[PDB]
Amino acid sequence: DPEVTLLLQCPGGGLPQEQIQAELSPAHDRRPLPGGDEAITAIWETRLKAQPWLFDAPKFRLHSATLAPIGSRGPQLLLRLGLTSYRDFLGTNWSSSAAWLRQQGATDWGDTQAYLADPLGVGAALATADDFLVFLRRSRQVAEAPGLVDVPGGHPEPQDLAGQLVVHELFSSVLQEICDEVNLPLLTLSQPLLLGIARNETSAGRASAEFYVQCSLTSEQVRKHYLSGGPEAHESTGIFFVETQNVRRLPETEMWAELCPSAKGAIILYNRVQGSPTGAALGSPALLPPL
Numbered sequence: 001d002p003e004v005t006l007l008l009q010c011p012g013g014g015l016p017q018e019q020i021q022a023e024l025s026p027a028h029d030r031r032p033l034p035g036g037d038e039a040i041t042a043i044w045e046t047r048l049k050a051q052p053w054l055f056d057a058p059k060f061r062l063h064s065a066t067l068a069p070i071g072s073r074g075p076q077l078l079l080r081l082g083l084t085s086y087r088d089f090l091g092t093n094w095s096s097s098a099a100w101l102r103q104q105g106a107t108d109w110g111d112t113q114a115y116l117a118d119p120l121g122v123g124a125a126l127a128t129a130d131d132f133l134v135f136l137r138r139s140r141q142v143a144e145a146p147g148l149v150d151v152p153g154g155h156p157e158p159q160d161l162a163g164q165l166v167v168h169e170l171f172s173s174v175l176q177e178i179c180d181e182v183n184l185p186l187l188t189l190s191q192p193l194l195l196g197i198a199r200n201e202t203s204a205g206r207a208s209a210e211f212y213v214q215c216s217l218t219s220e221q222v223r224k225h226y227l228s229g230g231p232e233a234h235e236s237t238g239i240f241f242v243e244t245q246n247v248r249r250l251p252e253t254e255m256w257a258e259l260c261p262s263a264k265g266a267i268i269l270y271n272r273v274q275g276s277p278t279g280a281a282l283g284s285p286a287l288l289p290p291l
């Protein structure tokens, strides 16, 4: 699967909010472009003169994420975060010249991402009370991944001592994105666990935090809530459900070719971190069928 690479696989079935540290520092920002950030300003002007209703917004930037030695006490993950914007994204990762910026970054900084906005996404493996995962169909008229299958999520907007507020906003934002798009009450949702981080190589390597969230509603109740919002209550054009039993082999299905890279990330990390049992009981042949 060349369009998705794993940057991080979390231990212990995934990490809760209280085991994660963030360092938010201008040392983690994008470097100025070799010929100057004028090239980003020019792309943005051009775009606004065709779509003057467009607006900029701040975004978290992912620099790096370091996992502690496995089995250790205390904080298990450090996220190194800077700040970027939707505009910087359109001028770098989304640019036709994005691969040239990656080569220049390797040459100048020994870092393929040095000249890339790399806004941090969030996504969810969202499971129902009757053991299905939730999928969404993207409109065929949007710019990115048109007509492809997605999972719930988005790109959160800002606002360990500013760090703990930043971790809270990341965990908060994946629940908020589930409530906005799927139309579920917040009180039907578990506290998220971080499964890992996945990079979209089709979008010059921008990364998404992938989370596990459990809903106390069944697939049929989830569908009712989604539909009862009406066409204007969601950006997706449909919802559907796959048994967690069948998610195990989704990479061998015809569905796999229709999944956008960030949704492939969420499913690979779900299969490695929440799937793949380690113990004698869940590992027995009758409960873990071979092939």
Ligand SMILES: Cn1cc(Cl)c(C(=O)NC2CCCC2)n1
Binding pocket: 059, 085, 086, 089, 119, 144, 155
């Ligand atoms: C793929 N990507 C990267 C970022 Cl950043 C975003 C995002 O913030 N969304 C924007 C498109 C609609 C208006 C805002 N999307």
